[PDB]
């Protein structure tokens with residue numbers, strides 16, 4: 241296939257993709273999607289399949305993996321540093337109508353490949369979540385134990401997506417996304433080590 245950088249003209253399709261991949265409380269507004277493409281234009285890609293935007297990634301260069309400490313999903317734009325050693329992912333979605341076709345694995349490996357070619361980038365970081373924690377919440381399993389797989393069962397399908405591509409857990413940010421009630425408002429830091 242072919243993948244290209246994002247453009248402000250794709251805003252209409254990037255919103256329709258956001259509305260399909262996420263429920264209403266967790267969707268990024270039209271202004272936020274435009275802010276990501278304009279702030280870091282070389283750090284946003286769009287996967288095209290049959291001429292449709294079925295996959296999109298958002299990233300901005302931050303100072304490093306340590307700058308994510310105490311971050312918040314709303315106050316996330318202030319971490320932009322054009323001379324930082326880490327590229328923070330801000331979103332990596334694919335359309336539910338085309339999922340499980342090894343498409344999301346292609347976008348993640350492309351961003352990891354682009355960061356190895358951009359100079360100064362040491363790691364690819366980001367605050368992920370857990371899509372199947374409420375099921376383990378009723379079983380008495382704590383959130384921190386569930387992130388590190390200490391619950392006895394398998395990984396979370398969301399965290400296993402990053403862990404399956406060389407990432408490692410780098411901490412938990414409680415109160416990161418209060419509208420993400422499926423994770424008690426918390427987020428999970430993932431770090432893709434490079435070089």
Ligand SMILES: CC(C)C(=O)SCCNC(=O)CCNC(=O)[C@H](O)C(C)(C)COP(=O)(O)OP(=O)(O)OC[C@H]1O[C@@H](n2cnc3c(N)ncnc32)[C@H](O)[C@@H]1OP(=O)(O)O
Pocket residue numbers: 261329330331332333334335338339340341342343344345346366367368369370371397398400401404
């Ligand atoms: C920076 C922050 C915002 C982030 O990192 S975003 C957090 C990730 N997104 C979310 O949590 C919202 C929900 N979105 C999804 O679940 C999307 O399906 C996704 C996470 C983008 C995954 O993309 P997909 O369209 O499913 O395609 P792919 O990623 O290429 O792989 C397909 C599946 O094969 C799975 N797979 C592939 N190989 C394996 C192996 N060896 N073992 C187990 N599972 C595998 C892969 O984990 C995917 O699992 P599912 O989540 O159950 O679909």
